[PDB]
Specification:
part of a larger assembly, 2 chains, A: alpha+beta, 4-stranded antiparallel sheet, 5 helices, B: mainly alpha, Modulator of FtsH protease HflC (chain A)
């Protein structure tokens, strides 16, 4: 009754959101891309011991960094039309598989990712005016 | 490839200090080169739509 306490951890499919951030393609064109990631807790012991207290902010920072890195590495390859034509089709699945898979796994931290989507693609002001 | 090279370089640099540290990942964010003052790659993109 008085030597110990325990911590209650949510298990529902949590949702992370962000704001716009720029990018670039090989045609020197630049876009605006927004997205969101579904993440689930895989193994609870490793999660609690690693993240240090189990409040969302640090997990948010970890996933934010890693997602930005992997996506920005991927879109830098394909061409301007290839974004708009099929941005779901192999981008989302490939980046999901690469991000989910030892250390550097993003699962080693104890997090399972469900799926990744892209929400909107705009263009800068000057190019918009020209078109 | 720069992400590949910088990690081995840093790991080789940190060896003699004997700090006992392990590097999980070396992540590389955006690399905007316009120096915030030469933002005139806009015209180099706006060349196409005016010729056409």
């Amino acid at each position: 009754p008085f030597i110990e306490t325990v911590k209650m951890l949510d298990a529902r499919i949590q949702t992370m959101d962000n704001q716009a951030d720029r990018f670039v393609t090989k045609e020197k064109k630049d876009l605006i891309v927004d997205s969101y990631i579904k993440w689930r807790i895989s193994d609870f012991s490793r999660y609690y011991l690693a993240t240090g207290g189990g409040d969302i902010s640090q997990a948010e920072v970890l996933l934010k960094r890693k997602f930005s890195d992997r996506l920005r590495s991927e879109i830098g390859r394909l061409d301007v039309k290839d974004i708009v034509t099929d941005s779901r089709g192999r981008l989302t699945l490939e980046v999901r598989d690469a991000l989910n898979s030892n250390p550097n796994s993003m699962a080693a931290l104890g997090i399972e990712v469900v799926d990744v989507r892209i929400k909107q693609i705009n263009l800068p002001t000057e190019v918009s005016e020209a078109i | 490839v720069i992400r590949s090279d910088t990690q081995r370089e840093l790991e080789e640099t940190i060896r003699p200090y004997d700090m006992g540290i392990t590097l999980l990942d070396v992540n590389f964010q955006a690399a905007r080169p316009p120096e915030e003052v030469k933002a005139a790659f806009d015209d180099a993109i706006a060349a196409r739509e005016n010729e056409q």
